[PDB]
Design an enzyme around this catalytic site. Structure first.
Site, PDB file in Angstrom:
ATOM      1  N   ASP A 151       0.822  -1.213   0.000  1.00 21.79           N
ATOM      2  CA  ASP A 151       0.000   0.000   0.000  1.00 21.79           C
ATOM      3  C   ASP A 151       0.856   1.263   0.000  1.00 21.79           C
ATOM      4  OD1 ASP A 151      -2.545   1.110  -0.304  1.00 21.79           O
ATOM      5  OD2 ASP A 151      -3.001   1.199   1.828  1.00 21.79           O
ATOM      6  N   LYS A 167       2.032   4.718  -0.915  1.00 19.35           N
ATOM      7  CA  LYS A 167       1.488   5.919  -1.546  1.00 19.35           C
ATOM      8  C   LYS A 167       1.747   7.080  -0.584  1.00 19.35           C
ATOM      9  CE  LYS A 167      -3.205   4.993   0.187  1.00 19.35           C
ATOM     10  NZ  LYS A 167      -4.647   4.871  -0.207  1.00 19.35           N
ATOM     11  N   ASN A 193       0.147   7.427   3.001  1.00 20.87           N
ATOM     12  CA  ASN A 193       0.463   6.472   4.052  1.00 20.87           C
ATOM     13  C   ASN A 193       1.798   6.751   4.732  1.00 20.87           C
ATOM     14  OD1 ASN A 193      -1.979   5.218   3.758  1.00 20.87           O
ATOM     15  ND2 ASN A 193      -1.142   3.374   2.750  1.00 20.87           N
ATOM     16  N   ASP A 214      -0.847   2.240   7.964  1.00 19.48           N
ATOM     17  CA  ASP A 214      -1.824   1.483   7.178  1.00 19.48           C
ATOM     18  C   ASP A 214      -1.269   0.166   6.658  1.00 19.48           C
ATOM     19  OD1 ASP A 214      -4.059   0.476   5.945  1.00 19.48           O
ATOM     20  OD2 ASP A 214      -4.643   2.380   4.987  1.00 19.48           O
ATOM     21  N   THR A 222      -3.779   1.253  -4.584  1.00 16.09           N
ATOM     22  CA  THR A 222      -4.356   2.363  -5.336  1.00 16.09           C
ATOM     23  C   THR A 222      -3.864   2.330  -6.782  1.00 16.09           C
ATOM     24  OG1 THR A 222      -4.890   4.761  -5.200  1.00 16.09           O
ATOM     25  CG2 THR A 222      -2.591   4.191  -4.870  1.00 16.09           C
TER      26      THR A 222
END
Ligand SMILES: N[C@@H]1CO[C@H](CNC(=O)c2ccc(F)cc2)[C@H]1O
EC number: 2.7.11.11
Length: 339
Positions: free
Chosen positions: A155, A157, A160, A173, A190
């Site tokens: 995850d 990005k 985060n 996260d 994402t």
């Protein structure tokens, strides 16, 4: 290097002991006062809270069990808590307590008042290469740690990555993180950050994290991501294409590193070769980086976030304030027995 090898061997021993015997039920809701909502999602929210006895502030992630089930996130939610209670690294947000009640799951984490990297990046436009390189080095070390434990993160990005009071990154996260020794298959992440092998529904591995690092470095240094388009289908077409356009202000060393991280063929991608993470750490773009000094937090950060104290919420945004209800009947007890 024996010193890195012995560090990672001890890191894995310590992780496995907690992984095999997870902590459970280490706090309860009425030990905290609710202060403000810091973020929302399809099945949960994060709230700033204060412990009533010590006065310490924390970020409490609250997941509605019934919504977790409906959105098919049971396994992911159990992964998230089991991994977070077992890890320990300077650039990971710390889980302090966890518990559940009739209605919800709770993960009580450290509060990081500087806010998301995303906010600071979008405010300034783009980061200089030295500024991007400082954050990138922290992600490289964090992925070296997680991957050595057989963990994929999945995850990465800018939203985060939180910025602490010394200007260092804290990754948050773990909702998609998973312990994987070989391949895994779930579609998650994402759109702008997905590796081609995820988009193409393949069995994929830890190389997807190194692809995502390439996207993050490009976005920090350019101000926008490399496969940008208005709709996901068009983003996915650009990702699988094998082409990228670099701004002329990028250094040649930066372009070269990015071509090797944004390599469509996962068997040729930096981080996934025989020398593993060392192809990245030894790359010319990182020649000025003192890896030990970054790990030890001895490098002066490029940016110190502005905030007034550990209760300041000014670097997070405003959301409608909704009730935290707890039913008198237990919901989904079987599904979350191990939490
Ligand atoms: N969008 C959903 C709801 O908000 C979640 C992400 N936010 C954090 O993880 C966090 C924020 C501040 C902090 F100090 C510590 C952790 C996400 O799953």
């Amino acid at each position: 290097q024996e010193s890195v090898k012995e560090f990672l061997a001890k890191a894995k021993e310590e992780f496995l002991k907690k992984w095999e015997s997870p902590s459970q039920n280490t706090a309860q809701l009425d030990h905290f006062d609710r202060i403000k909502t810091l973020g929302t999602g399809s099945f949960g929210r994060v709230m700033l809270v204060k412990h009533k006895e010590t006065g310490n502030h924390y970020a409490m992630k609250i997941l509605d069990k019934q919504k977790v089930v409906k959105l098919k996130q049971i396994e992911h939610t159990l992964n998230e808590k089991r991994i977070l209670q077992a890890v320990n690294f300077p650039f990971l947000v710390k889980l302090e307590f966890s518990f559940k009640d009739n209605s919800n799951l709770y993960m009580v984490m450290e509060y990081v008042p500087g806010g998301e990297m995303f906010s600071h990046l979008r405010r300034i436009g783009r980061f200089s290469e030295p500024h991007a390189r400082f954050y990138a080095a922290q992600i490289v070390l964090t992925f070296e740690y997680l991957h050595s434990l057989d963990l994929i993160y999945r995850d990465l990005k800018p939203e985060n990555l939180l910025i602490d009071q010394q200007g260092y990154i804290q990754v948050t996260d773990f909702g998609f993180a998973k312990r994987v020794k070989g391949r895994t298959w779930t579609l998650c992440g994402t759109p702008e950050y997905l590796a081609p092998e995820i988009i193409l529904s393949k069995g994929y591995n830890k190389a997807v994290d190194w692809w995502a690092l390439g996207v993050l470095i490009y976005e920090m240094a350019a101000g926008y991501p490399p496969f940008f388009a208005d709709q996901p289908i068009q983003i996915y077409e650009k990702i699988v294409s094998g082409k990228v356009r670099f701004p002329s202000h990028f250094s040649s060393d930066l372009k070269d590193l990015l071509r090797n991280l944004l390599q469509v063929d996962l068997t040729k991608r930096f981080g996934n070769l025989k020398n593993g993470v060392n192809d990245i750490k030894n790359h010319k773009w990182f020649a000025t980086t003192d890896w030990i000094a970054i790990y030890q937090r001895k490098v002066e950060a490029p940016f110190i976030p502005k905030f007034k104290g550990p209760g300041d919420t000014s670097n997070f945004d405003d959301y409608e304030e909704e009730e935290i209800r707890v039913s008198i009947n237990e919901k989904c007890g079987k599904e979350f027995t191990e939490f």
